[PDB]
Structures are given as C-alpha cells and as structure tokens.
Amino acid sequence: GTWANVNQGLQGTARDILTTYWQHVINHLESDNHDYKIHQLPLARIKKVMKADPEVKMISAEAPILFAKGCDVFITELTMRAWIHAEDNKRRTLQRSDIAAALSKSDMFDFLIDIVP
Amino acid sequence: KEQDRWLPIANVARIMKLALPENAKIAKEAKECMQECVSEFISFITSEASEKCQQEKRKTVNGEDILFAMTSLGFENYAEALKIYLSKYRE
C-alpha cells in the first residue's frame, strides 16, 4: 500500500500514534486557506540546499514549497520515532543513538546510512 | 556556499521540540544529527529529480518532478500526501 511507510517497523501504541500523526498531516494538506508564505523552514534555505547540487539548474517555486511541507513531516515523524527509544530507556533527553535506533526500524531510512552509521 | 548544504539548526530544533512532550530535552548531538538527516532528505530526492531532468534535457525542476522522485525512491506516502498540497497550490 502507498501508506506502508507510515508504521513500518512500529508496534503497539507507537504504531497508532504515528498513523494518527499521518492522518493529521493528510487532513491538513487537504485543507484550504494555506498560507504559502509562512513556514517553519525558510523557502530560500531549502532552495539553497537544492542548488548545492551542481546538476540542478532552474527550480520552480513549487519545489521548495513542497519540501518545506515534506521536511516538517520528516523531522516530526523521525523525532517521534526516536522518542520511543528514549522512553524505552526511561530517559527524558533525546540522544543521537535514539535517532540511529529509529532509522534501523524502517528501510525507508536506508538513504541515511552514511549520515548516521 | 558550503553552509548552503544544511538547513538552519535553530529551525530544525524548533520542529523537533514541537514533536516531543513539553518536558522533553534534546541533546546537542541529536539536534545536529536531525539537521543532517533532513538536509540529506532534500539533497537525496533533489538528485533523483535533477538526473531525470538532465536526461530529458529539461531545465526546471518542478513540483511534479519532486513527487515523481519521492515515489521512485520509496517515499510513496510523502508523494501521495504532497500531491494534494501541490494541486491546491496550483488552483
């Protein structure tokens, strides 16, 4: 299914929460009245990451706009997935190793193998 | 131009904070790791879109190119969710 990544490698309460977060995301994206000016991550900085690639030429305004949204979702879901491991260790501080553990639960994150070995 | 490769850490950390309960702390190294992960998310997908663009001799990477790359690379859920957002933006 197209939504397999939503809870891949998750069980129990963690599974339900990430699924619910994705439903929240979807409903938000289906919404009208979007302000395409306000983002947690600046459109200019997103575009600069894209342009760091010498193969990239021109970029439609659509592309950073989509990344702004996608990156929010990415940070949030990975942070939530990482938090499971912090709670499993009875810790209130999220550590790098928690992110590493979260990544290993889903092959969607294989692209990060060099970023977080 | 080197610093262009990574999104600002303060913004990333802010999103992380909102993803966690109010009482949670985030380690310095966790913030930095996340900054690197989400920055790679952009570059990884963009590279896929860019090569398809180059192969087709097209000059502009557009919204559809990002969605196409997302599904090609196994981010099908991102592609489907953001297709909604893209069509709304274009109406």
Binding site: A52, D53, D107, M108, D110, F111, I113, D114, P117 | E2, R5, E40, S43, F44, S47, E48, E51, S72, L73, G74
Partner: peptide, 28 residues
Amino acid sequence: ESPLYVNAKQFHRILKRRVARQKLEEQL
C-alpha cells in the same frame, strides 16, 4: 552494521550521492 543490500529503490541514488558528496568534500 554495513549491509550489502539496502532498499532497492534507494541503492543507486545512495551511490550517486556518495560520489556527489566526495566531490563537495574535495572542494572543502
């Protein structure tokens, strides 16, 4: 730790990103 096979949809782009990153690191 270091798998031979990774996500089939991602593998080739991972290799291409490694090459691109090496070029960026040469530039410094």
